Amino acid sequence: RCNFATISVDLMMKKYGLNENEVKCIINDIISESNSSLIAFWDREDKYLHVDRSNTSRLQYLVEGIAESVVEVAQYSERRVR
Amino acid sequence: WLLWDIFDEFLFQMTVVYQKRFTGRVGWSVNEGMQLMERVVAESGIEEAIQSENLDEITKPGARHAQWMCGFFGIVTIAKVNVLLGDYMGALSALKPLDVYGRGRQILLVVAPAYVSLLYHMGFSYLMLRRYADASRVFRLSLTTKVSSRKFSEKMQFDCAYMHVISCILGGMQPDNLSWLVEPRKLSGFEDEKELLSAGDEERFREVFDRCSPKFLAIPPITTIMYKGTDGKELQARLFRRAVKQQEDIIKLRGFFGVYQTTTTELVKTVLDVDDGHVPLFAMRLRSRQLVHDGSSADLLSGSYAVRSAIDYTVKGENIDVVQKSSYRTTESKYFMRINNLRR
Amino acid sequence: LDKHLALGLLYFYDEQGLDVADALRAVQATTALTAEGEVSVEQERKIKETAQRARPALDEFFEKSETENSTYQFKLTGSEIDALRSNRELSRDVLEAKGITSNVMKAVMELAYLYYDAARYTDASELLSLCQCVVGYEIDQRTLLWGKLVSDMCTCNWPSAIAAAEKIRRQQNADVFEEDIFRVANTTTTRERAWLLHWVLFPFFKGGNQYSTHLLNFVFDIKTNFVYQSVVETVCPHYLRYICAAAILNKQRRSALRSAAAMVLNVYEYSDPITQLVNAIVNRQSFEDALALLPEVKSTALGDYFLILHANEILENARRLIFARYMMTHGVVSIPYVAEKLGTRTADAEVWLANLISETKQRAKIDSVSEQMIVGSQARSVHQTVLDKLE
Amino acid sequence: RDLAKEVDEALKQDKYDIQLFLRFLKSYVMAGTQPDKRLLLGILLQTLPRFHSNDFLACISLVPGHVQDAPYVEKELGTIYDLENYLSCGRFVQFWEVWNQSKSLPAASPSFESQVRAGILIVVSSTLEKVPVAKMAAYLGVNPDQLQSTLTEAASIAGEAVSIVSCDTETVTFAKSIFNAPESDSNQQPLRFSDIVSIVS
16 A cells, blocks of 8 residues: 555564564565565665655556557558558 | 760850849749749759869859849749759858848748748758757647648758758657657667767768768759769768767767766776776866766866756656647647638 | 487486586487587587586497498598598699589498598598588488588588688578478477577687677577477577577677567576576666676586586676666766775776776766766757757 | 058057058958068967957967967967967966067067056956965066055056955955856846736736
8 A cells, every 4th residue: 555565674674474583585585576566775774665666556547558559540640651 | 865864955045044044033933842843953954063173163153143133023022032042052161051041032032932042041041050959849740730841842842851851860869669660769869879870880870971961052953964963962061970970979978878867976087998098187177078068077076067968858757748748739729620611 | 419318318408507417318310420529529529528427428338439440441442532631632622613523433432431430530521521512412412411511510610610611601591491392390490599598608618709699699699580389389599598698799780689588488397597687687687696606606516517618707897787787877876885896996996897888878077186987968958859869 | 561560669669450450461462472480470479468358369370370389480379379368267376387578579569567467467367356465466476565666556457456354365356256247147045926917917
């Protein structure tokens, strides 16, 4: 919702929920990304994630508008051949 | 025979044209073809005869006589000046489009072909004046549909492209892609070429030089002949090379930074050492002058040296707003125009 | 081309570096004894470097030297080969255009020519090159093909090497591909691959050219038409490790790490591990562990295996890569803890980071006025990007 | 014959016109048996007080390679050309170390030294924003004391005025100033919103 996570730091290992790990190799590989929708400004020093997703729903809306544009573009490309 | 007979024929033809032009005023019409064809042939014929001052120097004061006599109504008078200016360009000079532009018989009437010819010369003038910022904007835009902008030699399209390439390289600008399959790869290549030119190469500088020297003199080519035109080209090439080298050095200083716009003294010093083999206070002094409008000399004890360069205009959201104001206006403008085509 | 299986064992097992004691039954099928000079001897030099040395090497040296002084005197039935051996001028001449064959035959020529080794080795290579082109010859498809392989093998003295590099990508690749009905089978492909690797990456041996790291990357791989089935069969662990090293050294094709990762896993069928770990952690991406691994691996190996040569470059590329990833997103992260690791004072580290940024692989500025590296946005401008795309 | 006297007068009385000079150069380009060393050298030595200017580029175009090459025609033109490049690229120190005053043309110009200094000041005023008094003096070869007595004026653009700083940073001369060529009301935050609401509503 819609993020935030690493709540906190050490708890992230603890509740999710096996003790206490590589830690960094496990947590980094799971989080990483970057593919698809953005996460992270990740600061590993304080172990805090400053997502700033921008945004869930708006991305989908833009995708729908892009999808509609490509159909119309192709449709009108065929018409100018004809 | 072959080449030489054709040269004599052209020289004869041009002399006859000047004689007709001096005698009359109605020997040309306002057809775009005639004025463009005459200019191109005249420029070619002057260039070809160089090196051999004995022809060109006799032709030019008779071209001047025809120039100073007005044509008939229409842009025909302007067309005679455009020929004369073209002859001057092939004979070396590129600062006199200013005199031509300001002339009081060419502001009375302007019809598009004579504007194009004037603009071509003015663009060479802007390059000589080192007005990189203004030249690049005009050249980057494609030619506007009017009546004509070329007819008889369409090598003019390449000429315009060449001038834009030189202006962009000078001014700190480049193309972006928006065309076909080729333009991605081409854009990448161009960017790389510019980077290489600045900081290293050799071969890029050679390529840039060969393209550039071409525009100072103006083209259409001489048509190289062994003897005469060779000497011509050699003299021209050296003069231009020295100037372009000096401009390249200024560009290189203006292109290096410590990846910041408010660089610490140490970063500046490292950049100066990389740029040239000198102490970085001697070259700091040279950088603060060959990189225009810097507050850097005042930053003294401050250590907040700035050295700045241009950045993209108002930011991020404003760029979106500019697009959408254009879109709003376009929707209204298109609607009215669509109605007007069926209502009158 | 092709062959031999015992020789192959000697080859790869040494490269892997577990031991030498290995045989190499031989000689087989270079030839006996014909060009060049010997395959076994080249292997022996590598062995000597690994680990001293032994009875096989002594035998190989003797074999190479003679048969036989008398035979050497006897050879040549006329009427070139001379100025030491070849007729450099002739070699140049047999293309442009000379192609329609004087006499006919170089059948007796082959009989006279065959001798060999001694090794002598530059001259031997030159002679072989001259024989290759006639062009019309007669004799033969397969004999010539074997000859091409020999040229590729040795000498790797650079004018011969550059010539052989051109020859490999025109000849060998085509030969492997079918048609012709049906050749070349697994052994031939494996052997060819081994020779190519020897000729340039850097075993110990010798490698690097300018630059053919690229060549190695290009051939084993690249999908038009494909194989990679050949590489997998039957079980080339050493080759895989070498490929990982090569990828790091090169440092790009375009696609670099991703391709390497796919190749690597191939989880346990045969999988050698010291280089592999460095690449596999880096691409996945964990940043602590990777950083530690790269010095340890560098120091550990070496090992044997000197040349040295390339590996200094590899170390530099790897450090740069780990850092570039670490910066990218992620923060908005500093800089003192970067400097301490890579190991000199802060300014040198800052300039090193700035060099990564200056390649236009990232948008970033470094504040030396608070020692923070700041990244742009750019990854992400969202609505604006869409508007541009549409229009 | 007129044009030559005009070049001499342009030195001697500190006059300049680009169009007369351009015509004379255009005569030289067209007929290459006309050029005289002293007149051409005079044109070049009057481009040096006029920097920053495209006068030098106009001269480059209209004078053949051979002529501007010093040993080919046995003229001082290449030596001048080097001095011109040193002045134009801000390499004032270099210019001073190779300085001469033993040529006839500098002697036959009164106040030659001051004219060269004026050219340097023109280059500084265009391409620097704010200069220290000592740094400015080091460009001109002049003592900073005598420089102050010339620079102090009540219009900055006619002679850069003092901006005295007690202790700390050196006293600078104003000269141009922050955001006098960077920005054009771009990159402060947008005022678009008021306009955008009005035209859609």
